[PDB]
Each structure stands twice: as structure tokens, then as C-alpha cells.
Paper text:
The human DOCK5 and ELMO1 complex, along with an upstream signalling factor, a constitutively active mutant of RhoGQ61L tagged with polyhistidine at the C-terminus, and a substrate, nucleotide-free mutant Rac1G15A also tagged with a poly His-tag at its C-terminus, were reacted on a grid coated with a lipid membrane [67PC/21PA/6PIP3/6DOGS-NTA Ni (mol%)], followed by cryo-EM data collection. We then modelled the entire complex molecule using the reported structures. ELMO1NTD, which interacted with DHR-2 via the Ras-binding domain (RBD) in its auto-inhibited closed form (right), diverged from DHR-2 and expanded along the lipid membrane surface due to the binding of RhoG to the RBD (left). This large conformational change brought DHR-2 into close proximity to the lipid membrane and allowed it to bind to the membrane-anchored Rac1. ELMO1CTD, which is tightly bound to the SH3 and helical region of DOCK5, also rotated along with DOCK5 such that the variable loop connecting strands β1 and β2 (VL1) on the ELMO1 PH domain was oriented toward the lipid membrane.
Herein, we present a new conformation in which DOCK5, ELMO1, RhoG, and Rac1 are aligned on a plane and symmetrically flattened, as revealed by cryo-EM using a lipid membrane-coated grid.
Author numbering:
A (entry chain A): 1 to 727
B (entry chain B): 1006 to 1293
C (entry chain B): 1 to 139
Amino acid sequence: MPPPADIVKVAIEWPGAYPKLMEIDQKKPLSAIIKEVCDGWSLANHEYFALQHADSSNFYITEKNRNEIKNGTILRLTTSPAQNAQQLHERIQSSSMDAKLEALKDLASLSRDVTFAQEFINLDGISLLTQMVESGTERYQKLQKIMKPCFGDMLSFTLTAFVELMDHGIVSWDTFSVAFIKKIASFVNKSAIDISILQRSLAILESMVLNSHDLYQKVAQEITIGQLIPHLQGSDQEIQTYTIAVINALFLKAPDERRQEMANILAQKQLRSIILTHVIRAQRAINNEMAHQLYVLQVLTFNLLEDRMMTKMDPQDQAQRDIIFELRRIAFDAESEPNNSSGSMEKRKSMYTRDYKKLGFINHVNPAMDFTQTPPGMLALDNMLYFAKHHQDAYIRIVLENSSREDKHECPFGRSSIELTKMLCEILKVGELPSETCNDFHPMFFTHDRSFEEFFCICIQLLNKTWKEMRATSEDFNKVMQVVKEQVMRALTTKPSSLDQFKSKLQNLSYTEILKIRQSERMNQEDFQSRPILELKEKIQPEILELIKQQRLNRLVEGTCFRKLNARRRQDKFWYCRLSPNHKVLHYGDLEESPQGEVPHDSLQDKLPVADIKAVVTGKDCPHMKEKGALKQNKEVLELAFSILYDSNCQLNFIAPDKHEYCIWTDGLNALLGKDMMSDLTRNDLDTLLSMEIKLRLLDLENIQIPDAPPPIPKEPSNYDFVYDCN
Amino acid sequence: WMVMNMTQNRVFLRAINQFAEVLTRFFMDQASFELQLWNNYFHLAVAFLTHESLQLETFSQAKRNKIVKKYGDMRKEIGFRIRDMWYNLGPHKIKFIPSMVGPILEVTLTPEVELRKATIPIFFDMMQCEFNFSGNGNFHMFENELITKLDQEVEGGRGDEQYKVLLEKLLLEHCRKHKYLSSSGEVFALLVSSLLENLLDYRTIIMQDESKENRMSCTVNVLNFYKEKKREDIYIRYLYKLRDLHRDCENYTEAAYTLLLHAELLQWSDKPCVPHLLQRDSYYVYTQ
Amino acid sequence: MARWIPTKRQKYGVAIYNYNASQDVELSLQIGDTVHILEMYEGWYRGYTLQNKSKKGIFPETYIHLKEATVEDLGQHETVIPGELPLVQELTSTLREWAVIWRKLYVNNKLTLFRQLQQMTYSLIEWRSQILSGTLPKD
């Protein structure tokens, strides 16, 4: 039974006055709330007060967004919107410049509400603004040279207000006049405008292009390719995004013939080269808007190819016959004599059949039957034209290679090209509306105006090389498709810079080395610190440390040659301290010089109670090193100090040869007390043991992602009824 | 080439199986002549049986998994063939005794359970056959060397205790399957099991730290069993071991006691008819 | 824990991390805890863990990565390239043997042989990760 929520706490602030507390119920209509507020505060004229949110939004209470009210939130009382609109209208024609400035600033800041915008427009605000703009053309000219900054700022605020009003769509389409377009054009024509003014003008232009198509023609009448290029010279990324977006808007609702014309204009100006030398080489904060610009320019290039490739090439075209005749002449000038150029069509058909029986073509009477399917259609013809123009050596090599295929696995060029084009269209998502969230960008599209063709050429050359290496058969079409899709995805994810460098890096990439190194780095970071991975190894540590201590004890059992203290005057310096196979007693004492090692026998001091050993002091706490007479130890053996303290009056101080076995001995001594290890050798072994065990156990999750959040617990039946018998 | 070894053993199993089938085909009771070949037959069968066992493959479980996946255990069907051949052979077990006592021990002390469970009743069958043969007297002359070979097996390191419990359960079952001779059978088998746990303690303490009292109790128990069964060979060798250990602990009084035991169990006959009291370390006249 | 159906499309029971101790038979499961499950349920799977094949362990479907692959990876076309996943499974057996190898290699100090074995196993796991997915020509 939840407690009632009809009681809430909220403070209503005032400018310069401290708040007052009252309970407000949002279920009741706002009129009732206002009446109750007026009754509580004894305030008349209930229609002259309203409510607003004092948060960062600074918005009034609305019927659709009133749930943002939360207990313990600052809220201040404001004047009613009608009074605010009235005072703003009165101060529009006031005699104070500062009053106009602040009123316009407040109006622009508080123009994010729709219903109050409707209320303000109901007072013929739009008509008044239009009249003051039309009559203000020559009014501000006298004081323009005096207060250009403030006037420009107010103009920018007014433009923002108009933009948001258009976004809400309150203003009718027919209400737009040519005066606004003329004013924007005049602002653009001015050579003393700021970058912000230019950005606002270009935003207005792109919005107008989005509005209609005739206005787009009107603005294109005053668009030159030589003025938007100086805009690219500015290193600012935002202005580049705006200019590219307007350029795309030029390609949205224009005839395809004019699309080709302006594409040719861009090519003759070589826009992509200056784009590469300006925005591609920039290492600043690349915008997601810039990524959208790259994607939409890629789509524009795709459409400029499609509007010429979407059509079907008629097989009955004699001009097409002549074009393919010249193409096959410049391609197959090894098997076909040069004299057939002036020959008859019978030799043409003979060459057709003899050169298509080796290229996997079935029909030899109508060779142009395979040209009625788009994509690509005539695009492959342009590709082979380019191959003959630039790659004539490779063209002749391929021509003499495909016909020389003696493995009975000749690849049909047309079918492979069609399949690759279909795969590229599928992966690149050609024919779909632009996404509102995805911001993928490929910097290789601006290297050339024909960058898609160059990418296709690189892809087909790589595929030909890979197929030559593999010598594939007819049973791995799925393998070919999946491998080409994966390699294209991997190439695009690398974000290449130059076509030659991209092609070199295609072969330079190893066999999934990046994935392996990323997995290793992630595993190392998780082992250092992680929530869902690190706890796995430390959770299970009962056996590794136990076996480490067992190994240390075995090292104690086998034993070695020990050293005594102050062996100077006919005193032995080598002896043994061997642990019993029961791991309970120590055999040690004064022994002779045994080069072989330990001598298995009973020593002088055969008993060493391990159940009464307090601890083993390490370092300078050894009593034997504190000698003040003649038995002082050397300073170089400070790292070899360890004494098994017992009986509180006698000490068994042993001397180690060097550091590693001293650490082994102290590890054994600490394991005898059932404590942690204190050895550099052990920590070296400790890390590799756990790492090796985890490396062994991670095999089951190979090729499978490991979720980080704990998986849920689905419900189970309460009964233990076994449909299938156990065991 | 352990795979070569196992294929060789598989074909050896095939060869032994076809030998058994041809023996059953033409060497039944009517072929009562030249029956000595069965001794070498079963000697070869046991020698083949006594390798590639559980402890051989026990190093890693994967080896056991793969071998049971591809071939399965072979010693099991080896024991099955041995037991069915013994069942179908006939009443001629009397001649087998001095030869069959030894080899059956290895399959007797097998680490597994199921095959030994199926093989145990061969002991009841041979005991009843031995009684049928030796009703004109006693039948100790099997248990004597049975104990000898059991001692040798445990000294080889193949003793077990839950196996002793299983042995006792099975022999109680077989005695309940039998008549008044069940009492003698079960008391002798209780002696056998007590001696077996004696040697189990001896072997499980000879590897641990020396204590020198539990081993002494176990050894005096084996001496009691041997003097109870009128057997001296294992008795004299074990008192020799006692005397060596007592020399190690400079205890002359118990050494004198054991020497008196040897003297009182040694007759005044001056002809060394039984050569077991001699020592095989050297070779000379060794006159008594 | 009712409605359990025999199935053979779950021989590769993939864990995630140390499973919760809500179930007594279940402990902090390791990464490579393959469960040879013989019973099927919509959201839970109880089968024999590789660590203890004689002990059942109930594992949620969300904790189990769906692996229809059996020991034979050619019947269900699981192999990325035919005749290669038998190599990966025998390599898994080899690594499960490497487990006891390193478990025994510390009882007796074989430092030179141990170090060279470490290098060999490092190269082995590198190559196993490289050939986790078959995408190279037959040579």
C-alpha cells in the first residue's frame, strides 16, 4: 500500500524576494491552481499571473511537458505571458537603444514555445515584423556605420527566431515574400560581413532550397563556383559543413542534366583536390555533421552515376556496336588481326564467338543481351574504357590471361562484375533515405571526383590477385562473397587517406593481427582491473598457491649447501639443512666440505620444532648482524639476512649465496607459517601461472563475446519432474 | 608407438580367442591326453593380461577416455574368457593347482571391481574341487602357496583394503552357498584377509616415516599365521627380516627370541630334503 | 526444474564468467567450463560440467551461448572450411593435456625445458587464435 502522493513541497521564488511554500496539485486545471495561489497570497487580477520553470530550460508550464516538476527544485514566479508580450510590443518602438537590445534578446531567447508563439502571432506580430523590415531598409543605413555590431547581433537573433518559427511551421508558405530573399542576397553581396553572418546566410539559403524548387533556381542564378571555394579556405570546420550542406542542397531538387553539368563544372574546377588539401589534411575535431556531409556527397556521386547508369543500353544500337567493336579491338589486339577494323561483320561475329566462348558467355548471336540489366549496365563499359585508356599493359595481360585459362575455371567478367556491384550497393545502402543518427564517413571519396570508380578498380584488382593466388573453383561462391564483404568492411573501417597508400595497406594488413592484439590488450587491461573479468581469477586461487607452497617445501626437502657465520679460522663453511620427507623436522648442523651437495645422514642438530617457530625476521632485525665486537658481518650480505627465531634467546642465522635462493628460502619459511610469499621469483611465477591458466580457460569463449553485466535468472519450474531419466 | 602396441594386443586377443575356440572345438574331455599344454596356454594368457592396465593409463584421464572410446578395456574380456574356459574345462583341476596358483593371483588383485566380482566364484569352484580331491586328508597345500604368492604380490605393490572387504563379503556368500566345510573355508579366508591387511599396513607404513612398532606387530602376526598353517618358508624369511631390522635397532633379546623360534621350528633331521631354509645369495655346499 | 528433453545440439556448453552460487551444485564456473548437457529447457540447462562429469550443473540459457555444434562439425556444416575443426578439437585436447603438463612440470624443476615449452605453447596459442576462423588458401 503506497503512501499518498497528494502532498508535495515546492517553493516559488521571486526576483529580489524570498519564496513562499504551498502545495500544488497538477491534476486540477491551471485556472484552479491560479485561483488557489491568488487566494493564498491575497493577490488580485488572477489573469495577470502565470507559472514557469526556473531550471535551465526557463520555460513555462505546459499541458504536455508538466511532468518535469520535481520536489526540491528551484522555481521562480514571472509575469504573465500576455503582459510580457504587451511590454515587448511597447518597447519595440521605444526611444531607448538598450531597452530594444534587451527586449529583442529576451524575445529571441524565449521563443522556444509553440503555444505562446501562436498567441504572440495572433496579435499580428508577423505583419508588424514584415512592415518594420520593409520600412527599415533605409532607416538603419544612416546608423549602420555607427552600430553595425549591435545591429548585426539583433539581425542574427531575428534570423534565429524566424528559423525556429519556420521549424514549427506556424508561418504560412504563401506569406513568404521576395523582400526577404532580396535582403539575404544583399547581405551576401556585402564584403564586410562576419563568418557568423555568412553561416546564417548559408543556412537561410539551404532552408529556402528545402522549401521549394523555384526559389532554388532563383538562388542558383546568383551562385558561382568561384565564391564557395574561398569559403573552404577558412580552416573552421563548421563553415565547411554549412557550405557542403548547401552544395548538397543544390543537388536535391535539380534536373539530372543540370546535375551532370554542375558536376562537370566541379571537375573542371577540381573541387575534390582543394577539398583534400583543405579538410582531409586537417587534424582538428572532425564533426559528425562533416561525416554526414561526406556520406551525402558519396550519395550524390552515386546518384550522378545512377542517373546515367539506370537506363538500359539498347542491344539494337549500332553506335553501341561500334563502341564495343573499338573496345574489343583495343583489348584483344593479340588474337584479332588489326585488319578486321575495316573488315566485314562476319569476322566480327567470329571474333565475338571465339572470344566469348573463353569468357563464359552462352549466346554468340546477340552478344548485347547481357547489357539490359542495371546495375551496372553501361558502367562496366566505362570501366573497361578507363582500363584500356590507363591500364593498357594490365589490360593486355588480363586479355592474354583469361583466354589462357587451362583449369576449366574461367571467371565470367560480366557475372562477377554484376555480383560485386550488387554487393557494393547492399553494403553501402544505395537507394535508402539518409539516417538521422548514423555518422559514418569515408575520407577516400574526396581523393578523386571519380573516387568510386578508383575504389572499384582497386577492389577488382585485389580480387583478381586473390583469386589467382587461390585458384578458386565453382564450389566456393559463398566463400568468395563472404571474404570480399569482410575485406571491404575491414578496408573501410581503416579510414584510408590516399588511394595508393590504401592499396598498399590492403596487402600490408596481416591475417587478423589487429583483432588478436586488441583482444590481448583488452585481456591485459581486464587482468589489471575489471568488474566482470578480473574477479574471475582471484575468485579461484585455492590450488595454485597451494602447489607453489608444495614446490617450495619440496625445494626444502631436497636442500642444498648452506653457509655459516664468520668462517675464518679453520671453520667449515658448507653444510646442509634438509627438510624431512614428513615436512615436520629439519636435519642440519656443522658439516664438512661436500662439493657434491647434501650428505644424507643424521646431523648434529636433528630437531627443529616447527610448531613453536614464532616468525623469521628478514633484513636488519637479525640479532647476529648487531655484533659490536669482532663478529661483524659484511655490508654486501645485507640481502642475505634471515633468522629463524625460537626460544627467545637463541638464533639460527643462515647465509644465502645470492638473492634468488634467499627469496626461495624466505618463501619456504613463510609457507611453513602458512603466510604469503615474499619472493621476486614467486611473483614472477605467480603472474605467469594465473595468466597461463586464464589463457587455457579462455578457449571455450573464443569467437564469442563475453557479456559484462550479470545475466538474468529466468524462472524455473518448482517441481523436480524428470521427463528424461537422470544418470 | 603405443597405438602399435594396442593394435598388437588387440590381434593377440583375437589369436587367443581363436585358440580358445579351436581348443573347445577339438580338445574336450575325449581329448584327455596331452593336457599339459593348457598350463602354458594360461601362463601366456596371464602374461598378456598383466600389462596395459588401469595404472598404466592412469596418468591422464584423456588416455582412459580415448582407449574406452576406440577399443574399450580388454583385461575384462580376458578375465571373462579365462573364467568361462575354467568353468567348461572339467574336473581336471587337480593337476592345475601347483601351476594355476601363481598366475590367477594377478587377476585376483586387480584394481577394478566388476571383473573381479565375476571372477571370484572360480575360487569357490577350485576350493570345492580341492575338497573333492583331498577328502582323504586335508587340503592346506593350496592355501600355503596361495599365501606365499599373495605375500609376493603385496611386496610387488598391489595391495588393497576395500578389496579385502569385497573378498570377505564374497567368501561369506560362498560359504553360505556351501555346507559344514563353510566354517573351515571362512576361518581360513579370515586368516587370509587378516594377513592381507597386515601386509597392507606393512606396505603403507614402509613408505611413510619409520615407527618400528606397527611393522613389528604386523610381522609377528604373519609369523603367527605361518606357524598356524604349518608353513615356514615365508615364516623363516620374515623372521630373517625381523632379525635384520632388530640388528638395525640393537635389540638382542627379541633377536634371541626369534632365533629360538627358528630352532624350535627346525627338526633334528640332518638331511636337507627341503632346500628352502638355505640362502640364495651365494652357492656352496650349504650342509646343515 | 521440469520439462527436460534429451538433445544432442548442446555438446558445446559455453559459460560466461564465475556463475552465481545460488545453486548448491553450481560454483564459480571457469571460462572453459564445457557442460555436456543431456536435458533441454526453455531457459535453463542442466548437464555434466567438464571439471566434474559425474556432477550435474544447472545453467541458465542466458549463461549458455547457443552452440548447435557437436563433436563432429561436418554433419551440421559447422566448419568454416571442411576438415579443419577436427584439428581445433584435437588442439583443445592437447591444451587440456598441457594443463596437467604444467601441473606436473613444477614438481620437478625443468627450467630450460620449461621455458622452451612456454615459448612453444605461446606460439601455439598465437597460431590457434590466428586460425580461429579459416580465411586463407589451402597451401
